[PDB]
Amino acid sequence: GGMLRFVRGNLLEAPVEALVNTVNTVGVMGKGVALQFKRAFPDNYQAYVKACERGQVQIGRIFVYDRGPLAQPRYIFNFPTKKHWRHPSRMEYVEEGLKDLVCRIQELRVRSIALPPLGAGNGGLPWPEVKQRIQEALEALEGVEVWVYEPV
Template sequence: MRIVRGDLLALAQTGEFDVIIHGCNCQCVMGRGIALSIKQQFPTAYAADLRTEKGSAAKLGTYSSAKVETNGRTIIIVNAYTQFHWKGSGVKADYDAVHRVMRAIAHDFANSRIGYPKIGAGLGGGDWSVISAIIDTELEGLDHTCVDFTG
């Protein structure tokens, strides 16, 4: 895993990535963190989330996506369903769901430059050392980068 500091969305808009992934809950709520920024800047990504069944645990380990045009570039935004809900404290990230969705992404976007934040480790409360190991395993051999947000 390559790690860079910066703003994932800004880097995608300047052409650094073809695909960006962010962790979503299964409640069709993109109300905080990078999900909120994506919802505001790329409403078609939120529309893709809304086309899924709200509150369905069957979404865990799957994704919805939207192709967006920005600055003359096409980016695919992947809403990766890595946690069931956002409420309460503690670990909300589902490590098995991270495995499954990253495996699907590796299959579906194998020839893409992929960028993502620390999925599941912020608001999801997950252990980044565990999650990053999962991502490294599932995306092994692909061009993928974790973007550590600098604020």
């Protein structure tokens, strides 16, 4: 039927198939969640740098790294919440990106996934608006467990 869950803790130790990373489109993961993802998942990071180098990372597209069929998590979903790191996030970026998140979850038969507060740290977006978008987008999903890490 589906299940969406608000939790506290550290996203990167979520017991899930797919992890959502918050990225920009300019090829650096210099702070926040993205810095932790660079440290925790170096291979994902190199692949992101390469994808940025092409022109392949843009707003409204998740950049997926497959860590292998025996990897847990198996997927890093690099979610663009910024264009340049110098500028804030925008609600639109989160709306467009959620739409692509839903597609790829289905396409990849992703059964469980965890996210942070998209755009609400270095992006400056109000959490309550971000949450709603996340709820409307993702509780819809059938046979997918969703873990959402609320801030404080």
